Design a protein around this nucleic acid. Structure first.
Ligand SMILES: [Ca+2]
Length: 1155
DNA sequence: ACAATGCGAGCACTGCTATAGCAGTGCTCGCATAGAA
């Protein structure tokens, strides 16, 4: 017992070691040390068998920021100790004591070099990261999915489950029963608020659970039966108006009758006031008659609660689980839970060993916060195992996360199993005066943390800090100062209004006296004025924080609640912005707009609003303004719009100058950052507006919508919670409400023998007594952390608090609080009895005063400022724009992201279809659009023009394409008709083209230097092409760069090369629309003519390039357009179109590019 | 074109029955009601 003062370098790196890193004892410096030792296998007898790799030293922390810092601190130490190995000389502690243990500085340098470059894979994860990691590796054993989705809901999944339970369980109930339930809970909402704690993590063991089968009906019967029989032993016993004590006035007849009418058709376990007329009491105030059965009724409770509950969480759990499986999702409780089952199951050894190898030695940090599930997994892998080491480090005095499931008991359990104990004796980080005061306080009684297994061993304060002191308006102040309210009695109300006031006063008192250089934090002969950034107010709950923030704010002392969870969505700004987006979204409606302008964010006046209502031209002015913002919104988005708005109305600049404006601004900006995300997830502005409403209505979701703290708060007295403060350090700290306690009423305790979480579904005084114990057992634990946060000094508020409505009978249930229990050494005290106990211990480091309230609204601080700024202004200019167009300088958008998702989509088609279904399928009735158009293009992507059209291949093509098989005849006949179709003249017909003379889907890139002006090109395009005579053209604007383009088909009729572009278009009824006229019409209609000139200009450049010494009119003679539809076996020139570029056009057009 | 409970105090008043103490009926009113992969 009583741990060995831990000497890192001499710690035996071999199996099971428990390390207690007291308050700020350098737990981190220790871990790193131990990490290095392991890497280089250092030590000696207390060393590890062999050297380990970065990817073998398992370290698990609880926080995410934790593993980051831990991972960071280590890469550094390695980089140093490694460097200090190359120099074989180091002049900085730790390292030197390390090199003395090194035998070959040259090797360690190498070994270390690897550890350095290996860090981006250091086995330092969180409890949760470790789990899903082992799990996902040994999937078979854990029955895990290779693709798990991390669930988020649950908080909802849970309510839904709790309600599914209420519907299938309570709805079918018959009135008599239903009502009973109702009087236990009104709805599913109420049932959850009672069982929510459970349902989460390890189900607690239910002391005295209901018979594994009692139905709601069962119990109900027994109860009603037990009730109704006594309705008899009174219905027929009410002929007795008996006799033989005092005080029961004849107004007992009032008592009497009140049960004769208690005879309803039942429906309510509820019964009333007969405690008197029992018998086991009538004597307390031969013994008496036949109604002592009542003595038996008010003996063992008449409830339905425990049964339902037991059924609820039991069923609710599995309901939620099932739902997760189905969804294929996984939560965190599950993550480390599934891992615990795996190590439990038969196939638990292959898993235990597997892990064990990967991580032969693991360091568990912040262990005082584990849980049965964790510790189990842990020992199931490393407990009693040669060739391995389990370094368990944390501090039981700081285990304050009970509410999330950190079971201090499972720690004490682990404390029992591992016999090797170690403590860190030196408290770096803090002042001697402090450490002395904290040690004194927690040394009062024995077992201050009241748990023989969690002893408190004082700690030596570090020498480098022996100089620390805090002087104020004269001399040095005591490390610890107790402020005591006056009086005998004191309610929770008082001890807050008054303590916050007091606290507030003392803060401005240090601050003001700080600017006057009278408040100094000094390290011997060095000093500095205390600044808001140095004060800190620990608190227990949101309210308490507010309570403080208010008294502070009442003294112009700005502050910031570091533990704030509210979301940006329920800020008055969110609402204002929404009204704005509604104005932007419709400046037409005179109302919503005015409304927008009325928002505090717009900083308008009452006068402004007025005039602006009586001047119609200035109104439209604004309307225009907003109509522009909607434009900015439609085109660039919300963020660009909002910022555009602010810049005009000069919002940011004004707000910042409006007290508390900075907060309001950051929040508005924030909203925008969220309103921006949401934008790129909905295709309509209105959809976003909607998006807002909901979020404003049902918020608090992620931590992504949590409020961003200001970058100035680093100069604001910080008010945080004992919890967020664990690990944090503060020059000066204040504990305004450190006396409160709040007694535990819920009978949830841990059995002191079996160390198990038991849930007595019956308020058994015995078990509640036990729980209430564990309560302050944790309050002390919190108290320890609170005092531990300050460096130079800490002053807390104490008062003769009293909860018991017992008229100040020398009560002061102060002894029921962690701090009171330590001051009044256990025993309760007089109001003044406290005042005397405080004086008892109180010198050099400890000192008290009376709660001296005060007033002086000023934080009497002034300012100065000189804004000599300006923003660089670039002297360059846009000028040219290099892009890569592609006969898209034509086709107006809509194809936005379309030519992106499908580079070869039949972009030339689009639309819907209707009643043109005529009961005889023809190529005109073939489904219109892009999806079907590309299907057609597809067919000819790899067809055997040469041979005949196999119907099965066609049936198969439609079958896969999602079309109806009943299209094969029409289609198989349609294809061929187009194949054996005569192109221009002498022969030429797709079917005559063999593979070797075909090149399908050619992708070209025609560089285009010297801006291509739409007009300049329209001129020559005119002179040579009679088609482009319909001159609307030049519909695009200047473009420098490249020219993409796909050619459906380019073939050669042994003599020349050609350009074929299959074009599935029209819904234009039949044949008559595919005539040499109609075709040449749609041609300009879609300006396809350009496609020609461009495409050919490419084939030109290509052929010229390939065919070494080629000529246009000797190798070209092409250009064929096949409008697939309207093409029959015997109606040539219909459906097909042909053109042959002027050759003189291609000439000028080619050089048009590079001049 | 719209507001939570519940618990005892606290004191006023009303029978009794060995003026006072103990009890009980009642209506009014102040008090205390989380934590953060
Ligand atoms: Ca085409």
């Amino acid at each position: 017992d009583v741990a060995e003062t831990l000497d890192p370098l001499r710690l035996p790196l071999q199996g099971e070691r428990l390390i207690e890193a007291s308050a700020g004892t350098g737990k981190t410096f220790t871990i790193a040390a131990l990490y290095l030792r392991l890497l280089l296998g250092l030590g000696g007898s207390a060393a590890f068998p062999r050297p380990l790799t970065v990817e073998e030293l398992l370290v698990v922390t609880f926080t995410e920021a934790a593993t980051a810092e831990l991972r960071g601190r280590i890469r550094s130490n390695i980089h140093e100790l490694r460097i200090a190995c190359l120099r074989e000389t180091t002049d900085n502690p730790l390292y030197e004591r390390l090199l003395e243990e090194i035998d070959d500085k040259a090797q360690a340098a190498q070994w270390l070099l690897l550890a350095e470059r290996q860090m981006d894979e250091a086995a330092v994860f969180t409890i949760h990261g470790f789990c899903q990691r082992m799990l996902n590796l040994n999937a078979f054993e854990s029955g895990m999915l290779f693709e798990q989705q991390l669930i988020e809901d649950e908080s909802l999944l849970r309510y839904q489950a709790c309600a599914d339970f209420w519907r299938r369980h309570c709805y079918p109930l018959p009135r008599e029963i239903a009502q009973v339930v109702f009087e236990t809970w009104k709805g599913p909402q109420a049932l959850l608020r009672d069982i929510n704690r459970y349902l989460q993590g390890e189900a607690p063991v239910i002391k005295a659970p209901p018979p594994d089968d009692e139905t709601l009906a069962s119990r109900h019967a027994q109860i009603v039966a037990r009730i109704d029989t006594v309705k008899q032993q009174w219905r027929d016993a009410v002929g007795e108006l008996d006799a033989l004590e005092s005080s029961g006035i004849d107004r007992r007849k009032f008592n009497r009758s009140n049960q004769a009418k208690w005879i309803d058709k039942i429906s309510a376990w509820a019964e009333e006031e007969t405690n008197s007329y029992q018998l086991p009491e009538s004597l307390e105030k031969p013994r008496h008659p036949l109604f002592e059965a009542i003595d038996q009724l008010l003996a063992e409770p008449l409830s339905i609660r425990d049964l339902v509950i037991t059924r609820a969480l039991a069923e609710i759990r599995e309901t939620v689980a099932r739902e997760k499986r189905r969804r294929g999702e996984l939560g965190f409780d599950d993550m480390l839970s599934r891992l615990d089952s795996a190590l439990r199951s038969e196939s638990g050894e292959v898993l235990a060993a597997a892990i064990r190898t990967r991580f032969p030695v693991a360091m568990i940090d912040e262990f005082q916060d584990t849980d049965p599930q964790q510790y189990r997994i842990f020992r199931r892998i490393w407990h009693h195992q040669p060739e391995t080491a389990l370094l368990l480090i944390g501090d039981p005095k700081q285990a304050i996360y009970a509410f999330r499931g950190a079971d201090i008991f499972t720690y004490m359990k682990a404390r029992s199993e591992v016999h090797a104990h170690y403590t860190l004796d030196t408290n770096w980080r803090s002042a001697p005066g402090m450490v002395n005061s904290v040690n004194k306080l927690f040394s009062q009684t024995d077992d201050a943390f009241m748990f023989r297994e969690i002893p408190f061993i004082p700690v030596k304060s570090a020498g480098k800090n022996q100089a620390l002191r805090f002087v104020f308006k004269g001399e040095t102040q005591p490390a610890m100062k107790m402020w005591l309210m006056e009086g005998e009695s004191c309610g929770v109300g008082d001890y807050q209004s008054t303590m916050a006031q007091v606290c507030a006063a003392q803060i401005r008192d240090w601050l003001q006296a700080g600017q006057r250089g009278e408040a100094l934090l000094m390290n011997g002969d060095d000093a500095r004025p205390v600044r808001a950034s140095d004060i800190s107010v620990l608190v227990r709950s949101r309210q308490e924080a507010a309570q403080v923030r208010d008294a502070l704010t009442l003294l112009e002392i700005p502050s910031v609640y570091l533990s704030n969870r509210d979301s940006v969505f329920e800020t008055l700004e969110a609402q204002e912005m929404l009204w704005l987006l509604q104005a932007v979204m419709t400046p037409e409606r005179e109302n919503t707009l005015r409304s927008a302008l009325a928002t505090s964010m717009m900083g308008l006046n009452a006068l402004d609003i007025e005039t602006l209502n009586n001047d119609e031209h200035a109104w439209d002015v604004v309307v225009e303004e907003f109509d522009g913002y909607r434009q900015i919104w439609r085109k660039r988005g919300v963020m660009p719009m909002l910022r555009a708005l602010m810049s005009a109305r000069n919002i940011a600049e004004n707000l910042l100058a409006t007290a508390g404006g900075e907060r309001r601004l950051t929040d508005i900006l924030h909203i925008s950052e969220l309103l921006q995300e949401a934008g790129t997830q909905l295709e309509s502005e209105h959809a976003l507006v909607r998006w807002l409403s909901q979020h404003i209505l049902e918020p608090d979701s992620n931590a992504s919508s949590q409020q961003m703290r200001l970058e100035s708060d680093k100069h604001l007295v910080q008010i945080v919670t004992i919890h967020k403060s664990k690990g944090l350090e503060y020059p000066l700290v204040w504990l305004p409400f450190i006396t409160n306690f709040r007694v535990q009423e819920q009978a949830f305790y841990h059995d002191r023998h079996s160390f198990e979480a038991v849930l007595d579904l019956n308020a058994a005084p015995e078990s509640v007594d036990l729980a209430e114990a564990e309560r302050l057992a944790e309050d002390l634990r919190l108290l320890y952390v609170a005092l531990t946060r300050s460096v130079w000094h800490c002053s807390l508020g104490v008062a003769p608090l009293v909860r018991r409505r017992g008229d100040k009978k020398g009560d002061t249930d102060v002894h029921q609080s962690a701090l009171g229990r330590l001051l009044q050494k256990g025993e309760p005290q007089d109001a003044a009895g406290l005042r005397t106990c405080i004086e008892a211990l109180c010198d050099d480091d400890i000192a008290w005063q009376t709660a001296q309230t005060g007033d002086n609204q000023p934080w009497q601080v002034n300012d100065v400022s000189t804004a000599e700024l300006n923003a660089k202004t670039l002297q360059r200019l846009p000028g040219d724009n290099w892009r890569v167009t592609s006969y898209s300088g034509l086709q107006q958008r809509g194809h936005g992201i379309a030519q992106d998702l499908m580079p070869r989509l039949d972009v030339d088609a689009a639309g819907v279809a209707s009643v043109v279904e005529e009961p005889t399928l023809t190529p005109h009735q073939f489904p219109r659009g892009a999806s079907p158009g590309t299907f057609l293009h597809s067919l000819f992507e790899d067809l055997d023009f040469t041979q005949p059209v196999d119907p099965n291949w066609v049936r198969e093509k439609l079958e896969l394409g999602g079309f109806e098989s009943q299209w094969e005849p029409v289609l198989t006949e349609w294809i061929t008709a187009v194949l054996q179709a005569p192109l221009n003249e002498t022969g030429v017909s797709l079917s005559q083209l063999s593979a070797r003379n075909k090149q399908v889907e050619m992708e070209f890139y025609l560089p285009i230097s010297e801006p291509l002006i739409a007009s300049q090109l329209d001129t020559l395009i005119r002179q040579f092409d009679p088609l482009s005579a319909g001159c609307p053209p030049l519909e695009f604007m200047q473009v420098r760069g490249m020219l993409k383009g796909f050619i459906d088909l380019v073939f050669r009729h042994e003599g020349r090369y050609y350009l074929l572009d299959y074009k599935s278009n029209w819904l234009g009824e039949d044949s008559s629309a595919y005539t040499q006229q109609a075709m040449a019409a749609a041609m300009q209609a879609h300006r396809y003519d350009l496609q020609y000139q461009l495409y050919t200009l490419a084939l030109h450049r290509y052929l010229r390039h390939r065919i070494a010494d080629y000529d246009y009119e000797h190798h070209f003679g092409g250009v064929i357009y096949l409008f697939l539809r309207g093409v029959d076996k015997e109606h040539p020139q219909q459906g097909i179109y042909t053109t042959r570029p002027n050759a003189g056009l291609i000439a000028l057009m080619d050089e048009m590019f590079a001049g």
